[PDB]
């Protein structure tokens, strides 16, 4: 047939430089930063808990819930119990925030609380201050907006107006109320906030709140839960999460798991590779996921990312919302979250726990070594499944914050960074997503690593990020991230594909950012480039030429180290290269070489005229692309030596005459763009 002649013919002038326009890409208003970096400085643990003295409201049961930060207060005699509970409650907050002043107040007077709150203001001064208020000892807070504390003699419950409390506490603050009708405290706080603004024109924005119960409801009295239920969720999630697991009908299908076993789960909440740490690590991933798939982006940032302690509280608050539901409570929050109790990622936790403590009698009796959870593996699998088909802009992948959690270990880091590449792949939108979920500082920290398997995968990510967000050049130079990439570009054995990206990364770092130009210079980048300049991969020659191109833009020191390495000499080979793009880059670089000088005598002038003479034999060049860049290079030369071209121009109405002749052939050009811009430069002389 007459089809084989057809398919086997070169289609001339049908490529990216021809069909697409030679333009930049209009980069978006990239709003992924948290420049609002809050820090919780100090903590009040006001803790009204007059032990063995049940207030007149709640007549308590015989087997009631008598636990209170994992202590029976009645077993110890009153004063020991109260001191101890302050110690435990402090220890529980120390997990989530170990660098804060913890000033605990135990059965406090009104005046005591005033001293305390105002003192913590003057310490923290602009930054966020926790105010935990327990209130099991005192009667339930009133419709008046008064919460109860004591008098000096312990006879009378004195009231304490919420208006007074938010006077003493500052505006950047956060309240945790664990007392029976705590919704009433939330409401009244928001009312007395409005009252301030209305009276001011003759707080609330900055105040966060967390409250155990709605204004109607009473907290549970159920013998096997602790009385501290909302606090315990908020600040010992895994401990009640496991105990609450054990109380369900779910345990029907995990036989040989009693509460005694859960007392002795081996491990800790930091060592990831031990059953307790594992569950903790999972938990974190899950709650962070439920937040990221439910809340609107702005709000998610405000709570779950801004500062540690608040983020830890809201993560754990999701667990409280799920538990306390099953005992007719509903917790309340000042930035009001949506209902997350039904969200399907909880049934993942349920299974994850199930596996991870059906495996527990075999551990704790025999001494069977701990087998890790399939959770993170399977969860990465789902993310992989989504990447296959889902290049779409449909519902984004549910597992995205779980991928972030997996980067934090060895175990699954290689698999995750590949999948993160294969995601950041898909476009600029996907990079916008992963920067929102907060991938950036964790990826940036992996540059400080030296595991040789990461070198292709980080390079690959950093490429894709710095395409989208050029302003990240700030961050990479601060941490000596540049040195990581300098070493990848120095390696002859890393494949050409990735060395290309590395060169590109170094171009972005160096691009008109003076400190980045300084750093990469003194990391010997000129020597590294010129070794790789004459490769068999045309992207690499292009980009490595652009590096040299950017590094000596308006930066005279780079020109000096260039002349000592004969950089300009070596770059002349790329001027007669078989790809236009390589020639463009070569021309670009030899131009921006010329562009800076600070008026130097022999060598600068002699070299410049040699460069110009070599660029002057690119008039007979096919691609107008090269000729545009060629006019730009000459424009840089024109901008320095204006006195000479003024004389040479005003004559006609050796060297400089030839450059002017070139600019005429470029002005009188068949392609429009070239003729336009050549005429602009020649009009600047005119």
């Amino acid at each position: 047939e007459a089809d084989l002649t057809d398919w086997n013919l070169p289609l001339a002038f049908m490529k990216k430089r021809h069909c697409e326009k030679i333009e930049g890409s209009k980069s978006l208003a990239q709003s992924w930063r948290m420049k609002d970096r809050m820090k919780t400085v100090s903590v009040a643990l006001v803790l009204c808990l007059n032990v063995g003295v049940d207030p007149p409201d709640v007549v308590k049961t015989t087997p009631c819930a008598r636990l209170e930060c994992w202590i029976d207060p009645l077993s110890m005699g009153p004063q020991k119990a109260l001191e101890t509970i302050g110690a435990n409650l402090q220890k529980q907050y120390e997990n989530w925030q170990p660098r804060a002043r913890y000033k605990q107040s135990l059965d406090p007077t009104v005046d005591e609380v005033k001293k305390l709150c105002t003192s913590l203001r003057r310490n923290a001064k602009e930054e966020r201050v926790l105010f935990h208020y327990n209130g099991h000892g005192v009667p339930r807070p009133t419709v008046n907006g008064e919460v109860w504390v004591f008098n000096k003699n312990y006879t009378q419950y004195i009231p304490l107006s919420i208006y007074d409390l938010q006077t003493w506490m500052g505006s950047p603050s956060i309240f945790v109320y664990d007392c029976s009708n705590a919704g009433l405290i939330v409401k009244s706080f928001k009312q007395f906030a409005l009252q301030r603004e209305q009276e001011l024109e003759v707080s609330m924005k900055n105040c966060i709140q967390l409250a155990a119960c709605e204004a109607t409801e009473l907290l549970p009295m159920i013998p096997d839960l602790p009385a501290d239920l909302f606090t315990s969720c908020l600040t010992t999630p895994i401990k009640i999460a496991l105990r609450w697991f054990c109380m369900q009908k779910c345990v029907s299908l995990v036989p040989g798991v009693t509460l005694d076993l859960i007392e002795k789960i081996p491990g800790r909440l930091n060592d990831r590779r031990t059953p307790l740490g594992e569950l903790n690590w999972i938990f974190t991933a899950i709650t962070d996921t439920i937040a990221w798939n439910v809340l609107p982006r702005d709000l998610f940032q405000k709570l779950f990312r801004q500062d540690l302690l608040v983020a830890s509280l809201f993560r754990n608050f999701l667990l409280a919302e799920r538990i306390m539901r099953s005992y007719n409570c509903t917790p309340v929050s000042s930035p009001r979250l949506p209902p997350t109790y039904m969200h399907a990622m909880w049934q993942a936790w349920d299974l994850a726990v199930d596996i991870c403590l059906s495996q527990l009698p075999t551990i704790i009796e025999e001494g069977t070594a701990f087998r890790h959870s399939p959770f993170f593996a399977e969860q990465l699998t789902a993310f992989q499944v989504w990447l296959t088909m889902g290049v779409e802009n449909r519902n984004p992948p549910e597992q995205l914050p779980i991928v972030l959690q997996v980067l934090l270990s060895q175990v699954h880091r290689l698999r995750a960074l590949d999948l993160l590449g294969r995601f950041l792949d898909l476009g600029p939108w996907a990079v916008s997503l992963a920067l929102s979920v907060g991938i950036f500082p964790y990826v940036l920290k992996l540059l400080q690593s030296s595991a040789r398997e990461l070198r292709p995968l980080l390079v690959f990510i950093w490429a894709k990020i710095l395409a989208v967000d050029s302003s990240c050049q700030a961050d990479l130079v601060k941490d000596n991230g540049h040195k990581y990439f300098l070493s990848v570009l120095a390696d002859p054995y890393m494949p050409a594909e990735h060395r290309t990206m590395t060169a590109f990364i170094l171009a972005v770092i160096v691009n008109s950012y003076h400190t980045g130009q300084e750093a990469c210079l003194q990391g010997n980048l000129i020597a590294i480039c010129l070794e790789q300049l004459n490769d068999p991969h045309p992207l690499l020659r292009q980009w490595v030429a652009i590096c040299l191109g950017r590094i000596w833009q308006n930066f005279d020191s780079a020109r000096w180290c260039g002349v000592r390495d004969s950089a300009h000499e070596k770059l002349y080979s790329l001027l007669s290269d078989p790809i236009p793009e390589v020639r463009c880059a070569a021309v670009f670089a030899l131009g921006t070489f010329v562009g800076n000088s600070a008026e130097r005598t022999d060598h600068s002038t002699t070299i410049d005229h040699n460069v110009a003479m070599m660029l002057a034999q690119l008039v007979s060049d096919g691609s107008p692309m090269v000729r545009k860049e060629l006019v730009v290079a000459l424009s840089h030369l024109v901008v320095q030596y204006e006195s000479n071209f003024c004389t040479v121009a005003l004559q006609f109405i050796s060297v400089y005459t030839q450059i002017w002749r070139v600019l005429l052939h470029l002005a009188a050009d068949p392609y429009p763009e070239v003729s336009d811009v050549a005429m602009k430069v020649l009009n600047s002389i005119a």
């Binding site: 930091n270 990312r305 972030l404 980067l407 934090l408 270990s409 920290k445 992996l446």
Partner: peptide, 8 residues
């Protein structure tokens, strides 16, 4: 001072 703990 990153939010989660990175064990490099």
């Amino acid at each position: 001072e990153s939010q989660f703990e990175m064990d490099i």
